[PDB]
């Protein structure tokens, strides 16, 4: 949950981009500029929502810690997603988008968990929602959560 000093100053850097007048707070106006300057055209209403949902102190603008806390929450969500994707990739030994019984066995072994044939097949079936005999990425996420 603690950020490093370089993550904080990069985040300051990023904040700086949004903070057009450098007053240390980001307005609806400034937010709109940054987006327009990237193709997007949002309503005042939408800008107001984006600010308001970030504006923990309700003063009407986003300051550095408010920005930072958003970024840290996004980062924590990406991280978690990545972790799940990496784990799937480790299991999916032929990189085919499915974990097979054989792939689950081999990998499970190489992680110091040696399973029986029966246990391997049970673990596939538990997770195998659509009954095709192999575990796709969303089955793998589903069953990971179960816990
Ligand atoms: Ca500003
Ligand atoms: Ca604020
Ligand atoms: Ca595979
Ligand atoms: Ca399946």
Q: Where are the domains of the chain?
A: 1-76, 77-147
Residue with tokens 């097949």: 121
Distance 12 CA to ligand 2 centre (A): 15
Distance 78 CA to ligand 3 centre (A): 24
Q: Which string of DSSP letters, residue by residue, matches 106-128?
A: HHHHHTT----HHHHHHHHHHH-
User: What are the counts of helices (DSSP H) followed by strands (DSSP E) for the chain?
Assistant: 7, 2
CA quadruple 69, 73, 74, 75: dihedral sign: positive
Residue with tokens 């949002």: 42
Half-sphere exposure of 100 (CA within 13 A, CB side): 7
* Tokens (6 digits) for 125: 């079936």
Resolution expressed in Å: 2.3
SS3 93: coil
Distance 95 CA to ligand 3 centre (A): 5
b/e 94-129 (16+ beta carbons within 10 angstroms → b): eeeebbbbebbbebbeeeeeeeeeeebbebbeebbe
Q: What is the number of the ligand closest to the CA of 64?
A: 2
* Structure solved via: X-ray
Backbone angles phi, psi at 62, to 5 degrees: -100, 125
Which long-range contacts link 77-81 to residues 24+ away (Cβ below 8 Å)? none
Distance (Å, whole) CA 77 – CA 43 = 27
Closest by Cα among 28, 35, 33 to 49: 28
């Amino acid at each position: 949950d603690q950020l490093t000093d370089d993550q904080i100053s990069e985040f300051k850097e990023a904040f700086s981009l949004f903070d057009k007048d450098g007053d240390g707070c980001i307005t609806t106006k400034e937010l709109g500029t940054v987006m327009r300057s990237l193709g997007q055209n949002p309503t005042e209403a939408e800008l107001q929502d984006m600010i308001n949902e970030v504006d923990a102190d309700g003063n009407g603008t986003i300051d550095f810690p408010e920005f930072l806390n958003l970024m840290a929450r996004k980062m924590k969500d990406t991280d978690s997603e990545e972790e799940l994707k990496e784990a799937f990739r480790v299991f999916d030994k032929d990189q085919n988008g499915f974990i097979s019984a054989a792939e689950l066995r081999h990998v499970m072994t190489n992680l110091g968990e040696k399973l029986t044939d029966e246990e391997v097949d049970e673990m596939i079936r538990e997770a195998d929602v659509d009954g095709d005999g192999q575990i796709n990425y969303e089955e793998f996420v589903k069953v990971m959560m179960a816990k």
